[PDB]
Design an enzyme around this catalytic site. Sequence first.
Site, PDB file in Angstrom:
ATOM      1  N   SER A  54       9.846  62.976   5.912  1.00 51.53           N
ATOM      2  CA  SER A  54       9.104  63.023   4.639  1.00 51.53           C
ATOM      3  C   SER A  54       8.484  61.678   4.259  1.00 51.53           C
ATOM      4  CB  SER A  54      10.031  63.503   3.518  1.00 51.53           C
ATOM      5  OG  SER A  54       9.970  64.911   3.404  1.00 51.53           O
ATOM      6  N   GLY A  55       7.682  61.693   3.200  1.00 58.07           N
ATOM      7  CA  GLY A  55       6.985  60.499   2.707  1.00 58.07           C
ATOM      8  C   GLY A  55       5.941  60.878   1.667  1.00 58.07           C
ATOM      9  N   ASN A  56       5.252  59.878   1.114  1.00 61.41           N
ATOM     10  CA  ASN A  56       4.304  60.110  -0.012  1.00 61.41           C
ATOM     11  C   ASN A  56       2.953  60.779   0.330  1.00 61.41           C
ATOM     12  OD1 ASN A  56       3.000  57.826   1.028  1.00 61.41           O
ATOM     13  ND2 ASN A  56       3.707  56.463  -0.613  1.00 61.41           N
ATOM     14  N   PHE A  57       2.770  61.069   1.618  1.00 57.13           N
ATOM     15  CA  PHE A  57       1.650  61.850   2.183  1.00 57.13           C
ATOM     16  C   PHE A  57       1.957  63.358   2.219  1.00 57.13           C
ATOM     17  CE2 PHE A  57       4.243  62.091   5.973  1.00 57.13           C
ATOM     18  CZ  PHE A  57       4.831  60.838   6.088  1.00 57.13           C
ATOM     19  N   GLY A  58       3.237  63.689   2.397  1.00 52.87           N
ATOM     20  CA  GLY A  58       3.697  65.053   2.636  1.00 52.87           C
ATOM     21  C   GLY A  58       4.916  65.032   3.542  1.00 52.87           C
ATOM     22  N   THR A  59       4.837  65.733   4.674  1.00 53.61           N
ATOM     23  CA  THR A  59       5.950  65.829   5.623  1.00 53.61           C
ATOM     24  C   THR A  59       5.470  65.698   7.069  1.00 53.61           C
ATOM     25  OG1 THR A  59       5.817  68.269   5.675  1.00 53.61           O
ATOM     26  CG2 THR A  59       7.328  67.285   4.073  1.00 53.61           C
TER      27      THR A  59
ATOM     28  N   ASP B  18       1.977  47.643  10.890  1.00 60.33           N
ATOM     29  CA  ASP B  18       3.223  48.327  10.514  1.00 60.33           C
ATOM     30  C   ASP B  18       4.139  48.473  11.712  1.00 60.33           C
ATOM     31  OD1 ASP B  18       5.074  49.465   8.774  1.00 60.33           O
ATOM     32  OD2 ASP B  18       4.153  51.439   8.691  1.00 60.33           O
TER      33      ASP B  18
END
EC number: 2.7.10.2
Length: 264
Positions: A17-22, A127
């Site tokens: 998961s994360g702030n973009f979706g999954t 990153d």
Amino acid sequence: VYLDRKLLTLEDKELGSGNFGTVKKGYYQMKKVVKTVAVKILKPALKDELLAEANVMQQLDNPYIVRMIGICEAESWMLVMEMAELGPLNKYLQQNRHVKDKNIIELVHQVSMGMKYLEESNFVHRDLAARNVLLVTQHYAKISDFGLSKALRADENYYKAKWPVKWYAPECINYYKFSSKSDVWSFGVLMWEAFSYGQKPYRGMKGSEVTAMLEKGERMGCPAGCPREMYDLMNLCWTYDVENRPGFAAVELRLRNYYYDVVN
Ligand SMILES: Cc1cn(-c2nc(Nc3cc(C)c(OCCO)c(C)c3)ncc2F)cc1CN1CC[C@@H](O)C1
């Protein structure tokens, strides 16, 4: 580049998961074989972020970089990539302490080859961390997560900009300047993580305290069982002066030599 949604089966089990979706595991039907895939599934105008990521991945073609299969538009936007079954390097190493220094060297060298290719292609990763190295096998690693990557202009050797401060070179913090030499800094941190079996760098410290530590010339110590020559390389990657800090050609070359000395 554009994939048929009806040839894609997604497993209900989430992978991450994360702030973009999954991100989810699934299967993409090819002509006669099914290919297991990792699919980054999109949930305001962060659509263009995913397309940029896919646009970066479409241009890359190397064994030590995660391959993009394509994009799918249906219900949500979806970036389809090849599957690295063993997952992130740091989690793998946390749970597999028996892994030998020679094996770790092998994996970090593979990452250095992928990054050398990325350097030649004039892309900055921005990153690079052990979490963003995914294992196909115990002896095969690929670089993932090109969401922050940038194609350098033909006339510039850097890109001028929520940051992973612990992986960042001083010039990134002080001047917002991202280059392949700044990717080299992050690789040093990545190496430290690998040889620490997935331990967090700068444990318990805030970014500002990390920045302060580095400014004073202080560096993380040599991990337990890490060959001295590999720690030497970490410190070389953590050369404060960007211009004197080596590139991936030289970093890769040092890893290559050391590794094949260990097999002799
Ligand atoms: C953009 C992206 C691509 N992938 C992929 N994952 C995999 N395999 C994979 C990934 C994970 C996180 C994983 O661990 C699941 C939790 O135990 C396992 C067993 C396999 N294979 C291929 C991929 F292209 C994963 C991501 C999400 N990133 C967020 C931080 C970084 O860890 C991964």
